[PDB]
């Protein structure tokens, strides 16, 4: 009836389709089943993420189907699979906290500006730039 209001934030990464096995069972009741277990992710996410950081979908449709306004790859996985470095939180003080470039931010916009927008594609660029940078640090390029 709306956007993802089944916010039981738990899943495998984008490697195996929203695997409950890596989601964990602290999720109460929501209705994931064999109707939309592998419906659209393995069909139109092949340009998003395959086995990297991935916040998972909890979206359900209004006519007994599974549909939503889909978006592009996650920024913290694009500017991190294009940066090599898997840093961020955990070691954000004495080590390099992930490679964030200016062309990396413009490219993160170019990659995650399909329907994931802000006050502009440039505002979503500032968005994915805060993504790549506020992991704790950046690279010098």
């Amino acid at each position: 009836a709306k956007k993802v209001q089944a916010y039981v934030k738990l899943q495998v990464a984008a490697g195996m389709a929203n695997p409950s096995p890596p989601v964990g069972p602290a999720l109460g009741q929501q209705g994931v089943n064999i109707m939309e277990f592998c419906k659209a992710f393995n069909a139109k996410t092949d340009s998003i993420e395959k086995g990297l950081p991935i916040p998972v979908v909890i979206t359900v449709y209004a006519d007994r189907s599974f549909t939503f306004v889909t978006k592009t790859p996650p920024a913290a996985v694009l500017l991190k699979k294009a940066a090599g470095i898997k840093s961020g939180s955990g070691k954000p003080n004495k080590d390099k906290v992930g490679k964030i470039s200016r062309a990396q931010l413009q490219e993160i916009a170019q990659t995650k500006a399909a329907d994931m927008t802000g006050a502009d594609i440039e505002a979503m660029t500032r968005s994915i730039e805060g993504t790549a940078r506020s992991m704790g640090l950046v690279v010098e390029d």
Binding site: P25, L27, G31, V32
Partner: peptide, 12 residues
């Protein structure tokens, strides 16, 4: 979880 909760998943 109060016991030792390691958990698998959720399906309705």
């Amino acid at each position: 979880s109060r016991r030792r909760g390691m958990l698998k998943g959720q399906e309705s």
